[PDB]
Amino acid sequence: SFVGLRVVAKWSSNGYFYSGKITRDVGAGKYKLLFDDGYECDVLGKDILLCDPIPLDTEVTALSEDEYFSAGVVKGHRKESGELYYSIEKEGQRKWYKRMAVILSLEQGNRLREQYGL
């Protein structure tokens, strides 16, 4: 799990897992991360899901204005000019979300913890 890798990690006790990038190995099982929204801090490795992008059938939380909890299943990955978009399916229908808009609730994150642990 070295430097430069895209990851999804939670930086607050009981916070969601957000899209970020491993910025440096701080040692002691901690890495400094630079989240897509600009925020940066050290995060315990055990709270870092090492996957880019989130796997095809993962259940995730897709953000949209005034929408903080709507879940959906990743059904596609599309790369439009250097940017990753997720095709999220919810209730038989799909919508596009920018990588930064897909998040993982604590429960959703755990389902991936085993495989992409670190």
UniProtKB/Swiss-Prot annotation:
**Effect seen on changing residue 16 to A:** Reduces affinity for histone H4 that has been dimethylated at 'Lys-20'
Can you tell me where the transmembrane regions are? none
Impact reported for residue 37 to A: Loss of interaction with histone H4 that has been dimethylated at 'Lys-20' (H4K20me2). Abolishes recruitment to double strand breaks. Loss of interaction with histone H4 that has been dimethylated at 'Lys-20' (H4K20me2)
Position(s) of the covalent cross-link Glycyl lysine isopeptide (Lys-Gly) (interchain with G-Cter in SUMO2)?
Answer: 79
Q: Where in the cell is it found?
A: Nucleus; Chromosome; Chromosome, Centromere, Kinetochore
So what does mutating residue 79 to R actually do?
Does not affect monoubiquitination by MSL2
PTM note says:
Asymmetrically dimethylated on Arg residues by PRMT1. Methylation is required for DNA binding. Phosphorylated at basal level in the absence of DNA damage. Phosphorylated by ATM in response to DNA damage: phosphorylation at different sites promotes interaction with different set of proteins: phosphorylation at the N-terminus by ATM (residues from 6-178) promotes interaction with PAXIP1 and non-homologous end joining (NHEJ) of dysfunctional telomeres. Phosphorylation by ATM at residues that are located more C-terminus (residues 300-650) leads to promote interaction with RIF1. Interaction with RIF1 leads to disrupt interaction with NUDT16L1/TIRR.
The residues joined by the cross-link Glycyl lysine isopeptide (Lys-Gly) (interchain with G-Cter in SUMO1) are: 79
Please give the residue ranges the record annotates as the region Tudor-like: 1-118
Q: What does changing residue 18 to L/Q do?
A: Abolishes recruitment to double strand breaks
- In residue numbers, the region (Interaction with dimethylated histone H4) covers 11-39
Instruction: Indicate the quaternary assembly.
Output: Homoligomer. Interacts with p53/TP53 (via the central domain). Interacts with DCLRE1C. Interacts with histone H2AX and this requires phosphorylation of H2AX on 'Ser-139'. Interacts with histone H4 that has been dimethylated at 'Lys-20' (H4K20me2). Has low affinity for histone H4 containing monomethylated 'Lys-20' (H4K20me1). Does not bind histone H4 containing unmethylated or trimethylated 'Lys-20' (H4K20me3). Has low affinity for histone H3 that has been dimethylated on 'Lys-79'. Has very low affinity for histone H3 that has been monomethylated on 'Lys-79' (in vitro). (Microbial infection) Interacts (via C-terminus) with Epstein-Barr virus lytic switch protein BZLF1 (via C-terminus); this interaction is involved in the activation of the viral lytic cycle.
So which disease is it linked with?
A chromosomal aberration involving TP53BP1 is found in a form of myeloproliferative disorder chronic with eosinophilia. Translocation t(5;15)(q33;q22) with PDGFRB creating a TP53BP1-PDGFRB fusion protein.
| UniProt comment concerning the protein's domains | The Tudor-like region mediates binding to histone H4 dimethylated at 'Lys-20' (H4K20me2). Interaction with NUDT16L1/TIRR masks the Tudor-like domain and prevents recruitment to chromatin.
What does the function comment of this entry state?
Double-strand break (DSB) repair protein involved in response to DNA damage, telomere dynamics and class-switch recombination (CSR) during antibody genesis. Plays a key role in the repair of double-strand DNA breaks (DSBs) in response to DNA damage by promoting non-homologous end joining (NHEJ)-mediated repair of DSBs and specifically counteracting the function of the homologous recombination (HR) repair protein BRCA1. In response to DSBs, phosphorylation by ATM promotes interaction with RIF1 and dissociation from NUDT16L1/TIRR, leading to recruitment to DSBs sites.
User: Know the name of this protein?
Assistant: TP53-binding protein 1
- Source organism per UniProt: Homo sapiens (Human)
